[PDB]
Amino acid sequence: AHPLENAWTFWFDNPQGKSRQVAWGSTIHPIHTFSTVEDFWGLYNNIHNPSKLNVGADFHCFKNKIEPKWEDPISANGGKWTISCGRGKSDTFWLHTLLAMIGEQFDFGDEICGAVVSVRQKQERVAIWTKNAANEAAQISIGKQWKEFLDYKDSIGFIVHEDAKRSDKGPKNRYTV
Numbered sequence: 802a803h804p805l806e807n808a809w810t811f812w813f814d815n816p817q818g819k820s821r822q823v824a825w826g827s828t829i830h831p832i833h834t835f836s837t838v839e840d841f842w843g844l845y846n847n848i849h850n851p852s853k854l855n856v857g858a859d860f861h862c863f864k865n866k867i868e869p870k871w872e873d874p875i876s877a878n879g880g881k882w883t884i885s886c887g888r889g890k891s892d893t894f895w896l897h898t899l900l901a902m903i904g905e906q907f908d909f910g911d912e913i914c915g916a917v918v919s920v921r922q923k924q925e926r927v928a929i930w931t932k933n934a935a936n937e938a939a940q941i942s943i944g945k946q947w948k949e950f951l952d953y954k955d956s957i958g959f960i961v962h963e964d965a966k967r968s969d970k971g972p973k974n975r976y977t978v
């Protein structure tokens with residue numbers, strides 16, 4: 802078996818139609834933990850790809866003990882890069898995102914906390930979470946390489962978690978790569 806540098810945990814949360822504004826993530830839960838390339842596949846192969854997910858469901862893959870929540874102390878000062886695409890057109894983007902992450906392919910690897918693919922009504926988004934948004938140099942690098950890894954050519958934005966918390970209005974991208 803080929804061991805990974807870091808352990809990872811798959812997370813999942815299917816609201817089942819319930820609103821996401823009330824008691825958010827009260828059901829988010831871990832699914833599987835893996836620490837080798839082979840184990841990663843065995844899990845990935847027997848797990849619903851993004852395209853098979855119902856509206857409202859969220860699939861996450863975080864490093865070590867980090868949880869898919871803004872309130873997590875590890876992501877307290879972080880943010881995230883997002884890519885949006887049509888319904889059922891994120892299977893590959895998500896896959897490559899996972900491989901690049903577990904592969905420790907990023908120049909500022911420490912920053913990487915995990916990834917989350919969100920399935921919605923008329924769109925699907927894949928987002929990679931980072932530790933320090935105040936570090937513009939690192940984030941710009943993470944963003945560019947991520948697009949490079951997924952061979953994405955459209956501009957993307959980085960949204961600080963503190964701005965995402967804004968329940969009053971949509972968050973404005975801090976950076977764009």
Ligand SMILES: C[n+]1cn([C@@H]2O[C@H](COP(=O)(O)OP(=O)(O)O)[C@@H](O)[C@H]2O)c2nc(N)[nH]c(=O)c21
Pocket residue numbers: 821822825869870871872919921968
């Ligand atoms: C990711 N996330 C989402 N929420 C809540 O869930 C809402 C919806 O978040 P979403 O479903 O990720 O975005 P969407 O509805 O545009 O598809 C957010 O506006 C917050 O009210 C969150 N609330 C907390 N406390 N922590 C989180 O990480 C978090």
